[PDB]
Write a protein that binds this DNA or RNA. Structure first.
Ligand code: MG
Ligand code: MG
Ligand code: MG
Ligand code: MG
Ligand code: MG
Ligand code: MG
Ligand code: MG
Ligand code: MG
Ligand code: MG
Ligand code: MG
Ligand code: MG
Ligand code: MG
Ligand code: MG
Ligand code: MG
Ligand code: MG
Ligand code: MG
Ligand code: MG
Ligand code: MG
Ligand code: MG
Ligand code: MG
Ligand code: MG
Ligand code: MG
Ligand code: MG
Ligand code: MG
Ligand code: MG
Ligand code: MG
Ligand code: MG
Ligand code: MG
Ligand code: MG
Ligand code: MG
Ligand code: MG
Ligand code: MG
Ligand code: MG
Ligand code: MG
Ligand code: MG
Ligand code: MG
Ligand code: MG
Ligand code: MG
Ligand code: MG
Ligand code: MG
Ligand code: MG
Ligand code: MG
Ligand code: MG
Ligand code: MG
Ligand code: MG
Ligand code: MG
Ligand code: MG
Ligand code: MG
Ligand code: MG
Ligand code: MG
Ligand code: MG
Ligand code: MG
Ligand code: MG
Ligand code: MG
Ligand code: MG
Ligand code: MG
Ligand code: MG
Ligand code: MG
Ligand code: MG
Ligand code: MG
Ligand code: MG
Ligand code: MG
Ligand code: MG
Ligand code: MG
Ligand code: MG
Ligand code: MG
Ligand code: MG
Lengths: 114, 48, 25
RNA sequence: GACGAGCUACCCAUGAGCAGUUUAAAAGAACCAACUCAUCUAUGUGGCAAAAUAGUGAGAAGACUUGUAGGUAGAGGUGAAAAGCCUAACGAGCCUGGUGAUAGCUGGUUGUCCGAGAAAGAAUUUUAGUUCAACCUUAAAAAUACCCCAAAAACCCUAAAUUCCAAUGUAUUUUUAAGAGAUAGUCUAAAAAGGUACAGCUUUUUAGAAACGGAUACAACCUUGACUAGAGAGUAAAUCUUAAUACU
RNA sequence: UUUACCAAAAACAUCACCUCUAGCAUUACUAGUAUUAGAGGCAAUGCCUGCCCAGUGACAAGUUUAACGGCCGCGGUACUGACCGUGCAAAGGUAGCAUAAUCACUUGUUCUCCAAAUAAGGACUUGUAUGAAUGGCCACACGAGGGUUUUACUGUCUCUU
RNA sequence: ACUAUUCCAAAAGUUCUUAACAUGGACUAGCAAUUUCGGUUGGGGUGACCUCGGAGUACAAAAAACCCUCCGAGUGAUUUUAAUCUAGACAAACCAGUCAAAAUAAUCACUUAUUGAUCCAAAAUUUUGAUCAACGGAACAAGUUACCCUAGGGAUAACAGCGCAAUCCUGUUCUAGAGUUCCUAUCGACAAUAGGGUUUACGACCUCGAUGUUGGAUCAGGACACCCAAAUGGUGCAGCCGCUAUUAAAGGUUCGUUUGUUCAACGAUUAAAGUCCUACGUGAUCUGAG
């Protein structure tokens, strides 16, 4: 009996998208925080956005997650319109990641007393 | 249609770029690129 | 192995049958 | 690389047989012996015999049978092609070398007693195999390891639950140096697929198990984890029960 | 004539008929010389042997099938189709024979044969997968070949002694 | 290689030739050599697929199978030519993949997929080369074997057993309907619920250091879902035949023509010429037509 199943190429590995660090994790500058294919979490304070929508930590610190108000860039039109048609009482919210800096910025050392 | 690999030549020195071009030739290839030796912005000309 | 829903009435694991006989009305 | 045509295939020499009967006849004619074959049946099957015996059959002056002696030799010979025959196994002889050929494939692998102990993620002319990872064993160095309350992880609907962490209960875990085996699993509960809401069915994910005690019997279900002695004790799972009536 | 030791046949050979290839001397052929000698095909005899050089060959572009091999549609019309149209081919399967030692349907149809026959023989017959030297068709004479009937005979068997 | 062919050199001579030997390099054939004939697979063959990405399966960190269910890619379209060098990271068997601060001076097409490792080749100053698509890629190899051979496997088929019961097979439950009227004498659509384990399948669980496989012969053991004989209910049963249903397994259940045939047709009869199971009973009893 002809057993042809017409479907092809279901097979891909998973991309291991997801959250790499968790709230209250210590982080060094450069660590990737989470990696996603669509924006699930947006970059907050001290979190840089990679061209593939990676989130990495800019400072040395503690990673925090947050629900905050979303005010799209006036250059990006779709989001501008989505913001436009809302009923007059409602604001948009999203989830952000943050780094909270640990090390102080610097120190004043006494080099020489002349 | 096809894709042609073309080798660009800089005005000055031995700097050589390699890039791809279109069969239909939408935009003929002439570039402003970066030369390492003089550390400059250059005019690169399409060659073979 | 038999599916979660079946028509042949599906014999229960013994520990669960005891569980049944204990909780009767 | 030797040795084999004393069997058999075909030739070359040199010899030898063929009675009777019928027909003008030695005519690949009749009939029927010797002689040659091997049809059909039954015996026989470690036989009388590594192919026979008894009956019964075909041919029987011819492409006939048969004796002695030569010849052709294996990448070959010979063949009225059956891929036949070439010394009791010929789709390619036998022997001695190469030769302890080579077998991811079977089959075997020898004293005692103790420690610790494994179930399949990748690639692969790969799925009967290897080589990496993970687990693990033997040494070493160290510091935290499991457990883990808030807090936290998405946008329409979305259960059991995960991930991540102090306290706390414990002693485990990570690195370094050496190593292998293993990588052909079964069922039971749960979530799903495929099939017939079928399999002692197949395909993944999460758990369990493989008692000398129970379920008589029993691999996977249930009770228990472990040593050596006692003609002591307490317990565990478990022994199998349940039923059903009138209309005036 | 053959599978010594599971197959003697329808297989092979063979008279006959045809294709090729050869113009010549010391060891074969051959002490031969084209009416001869080598490679082969197909199997006497009788009647026959249709059309096809486009492919692959082979020969010395062209030529060849008694070389390897091939030898049709689709619809319209007097239930049928002599006719008709158009397409493709190198040609379009003819003479025969036919349910067959011929894919299947399939135990084709019908007659004869028996009390009864999926057997046997005779016919019809598109065999859509027969068919003419990979030979087609009839016929003597011959088979330890296969099948069918009859006579006769009997322990095959009724059914054993 | 050889046997032949054709040619060019060589060799001899002529001013272009080849008598027989005979070497170098070609050519064109015959005879002939050497080596292979990928893999997944609900046995193998035929069919289909082999890398890469989106969904589902896999519901909320990751991962996650099938010859699972569905859509895609082996590139286009531009302009703005999208640079060096180095912290820390994701991912990961490995190989490949990914982000990226500081320091110097690409976009749209669901956007995610648009791609091939070494070696070896060509190139210039530096780099380009594959339906290597069997897509971790052998520099280049197909058919057959019933003439077959070895090593293995019940890790895997054919026979038989077992599992399951789709199909098949016996019951009942429901009355629309047939039955002129009348559901249930005899039946009965659409449907419900139990069973049986012979069929064709489906699984691959025992056997491949052999469980010898169809039909007959002989001899039968068993079931009862009775074909006869024996008791009975109902009838659209007057009687004769009948048609249905209940109870009953001690005993029976023919001889022929054609087929290897069980089946089936057909002749002739019988009280009847049952349906089955037993390794489709029975080959260390027989027969091999198949
Ligand atoms: Mg997927
Ligand atoms: Mg995958
Ligand atoms: Mg290219
Ligand atoms: Mg001799
Ligand atoms: Mg001799
Ligand atoms: Mg005589
Ligand atoms: Mg004679
Ligand atoms: Mg006798
Ligand atoms: Mg005689
Ligand atoms: Mg005679
Ligand atoms: Mg002979
Ligand atoms: Mg032959
Ligand atoms: Mg043969
Ligand atoms: Mg011998
Ligand atoms: Mg060895
Ligand atoms: Mg390979
Ligand atoms: Mg292997
Ligand atoms: Mg912790
Ligand atoms: Mg297995
Ligand atoms: Mg393995
Ligand atoms: Mg069971
Ligand atoms: Mg497990
Ligand atoms: Mg016991
Ligand atoms: Mg103890
Ligand atoms: Mg003989
Ligand atoms: Mg013989
Ligand atoms: Mg014989
Ligand atoms: Mg003949
Ligand atoms: Mg002539
Ligand atoms: Mg003739
Ligand atoms: Mg002709
Ligand atoms: Mg005709
Ligand atoms: Mg026929
Ligand atoms: Mg024909
Ligand atoms: Mg011919
Ligand atoms: Mg023919
Ligand atoms: Mg004659
Ligand atoms: Mg004869
Ligand atoms: Mg005869
Ligand atoms: Mg060699
Ligand atoms: Mg293959
Ligand atoms: Mg295979
Ligand atoms: Mg298959
Ligand atoms: Mg199977
Ligand atoms: Mg195929
Ligand atoms: Mg910068
Ligand atoms: Mg290349
Ligand atoms: Mg491969
Ligand atoms: Mg591969
Ligand atoms: Mg890969
Ligand atoms: Mg044969
Ligand atoms: Mg063998
Ligand atoms: Mg098995
Ligand atoms: Mg059997
Ligand atoms: Mg079976
Ligand atoms: Mg058995
Ligand atoms: Mg059942
Ligand atoms: Mg089934
Ligand atoms: Mg299995
Ligand atoms: Mg076996
Ligand atoms: Mg044995
Ligand atoms: Mg009996
Ligand atoms: Mg009864
Ligand atoms: Mg009886
Ligand atoms: Mg039997
Ligand atoms: Mg039998
Ligand atoms: Mg027996």
């Amino acid at each position: 009996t002809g057993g042809s199943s017409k479907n092809l190429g279901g097979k891909s590995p998973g991309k291991r998208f997801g959250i790499k660090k968790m709230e209250g994790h210590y982080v060094h500058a450069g660590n990737i925080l989470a990696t996603q294919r669509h924006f699930r979490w947006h970059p907050g304070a001290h979190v840089g956005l990679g061209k593939n929508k990676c989130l990495y930590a800019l400072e040395e610190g503690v990673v925090r997650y947050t629900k905050e108000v979303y005010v799209p860039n006036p250059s990006n039109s779709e989001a501008v319109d989505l913001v436009t048609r809302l009923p007059q009482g409602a604001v948009l919210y999203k989830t952000f990641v943050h780094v909270v800096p640990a090390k102080p910025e610097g120190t004043f050392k006494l080099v020489a007393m002349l | 249609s096809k894709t042609i690999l073309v080798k660009m030549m800089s005005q000055a020195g031995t700097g050589f770029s390699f890039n791809t071009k279109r069969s239909r030739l939408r935009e003929k290839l002439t570039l402003l690129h970066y030369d390492p030796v003089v550390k400059k912005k250059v005019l690169f000309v399409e060659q073979k | 192995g038999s599916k979660a829903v079946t028509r042949h009435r599906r014999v229960m694991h013994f520990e669960r049958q005891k569980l049944m006989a204990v909780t009767e009305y």
